[PDB]
């Protein structure tokens, strides 16, 4: 539902490390292969950046 539907989820944690990816603005881009890879790897004892 997050991908093709519409709903927003504000997950609150206070502090988090961030990792960056610089894309070229003249071409197509998509964030799903990054954000799904972040959402799958959330563990009850760990999150990735």
């Amino acid at each position: 539902w997050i991908k093709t539907g519409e709903l927003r989820i504000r997950i609150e944690m206070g502090a988090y490390p961030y990792m960056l990816h610089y894309y070229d603005p003249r071409q197509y881009a998509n964030a799903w292969n990054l954000t799904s890879a972040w959402l799958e790897e959330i563990t009850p004892t760990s999150i990735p950046s």
Partner: protein
């Protein structure tokens, strides 16, 4: 037209912190029912099954047997939680055994032949 909807993908990221393989192997032996206690009770013929023994001597023998079982289950040579030779004078402790019947008599002789003798004491044969 399912193109493997984006909800699921497995990699086994989380491992169990007490451990499923460690908790389940103890629950397998917590699941086990209580051991049967059969001696003192009659069979289909009528004889009280079990061994012929003084009841208190038998109740001391099972304290010995369960102490040795404790010593084997704790993977050592001498038991630590001992069930015999404790501080308490448990000298009137009785257990069930095959020495007495359900009536209150002895079982030096089986019941299935006590009744056979009591009926075989009366016969009547034909005249010659």
């Amino acid at each position: 037209p399912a193109t493997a909807e984006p909800g699921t993908s497995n990699c086994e990221h989380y491992k169990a912190r007490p451990g499923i393989a460690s908790v389940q192997k103890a629950t397998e032996s917590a699941e086990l029912p209580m051991k049967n206690n059969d001696e003192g009770t009659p069979d289909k013929r009528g004889n009280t099954k079990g061994a012929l023994v003084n009841e208190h001597v038998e109740a001391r023998d099972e304290a010995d047997d369960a102490t040795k079982k404790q010593a084997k289950d704790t993977e050592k040579a001498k038991a630590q939680v001992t069930y015999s030779d404790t501080g308490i004078n448990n000298a009137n402790e009785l257990s069930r055994s095959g020495n007495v019947d359900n009536e209150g008599g002895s079982n030096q002789k089986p019941m299935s032949t006590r009744i056979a003798e009591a009926t075989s004491a009366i016969v009547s044969k034909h005249p010659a």
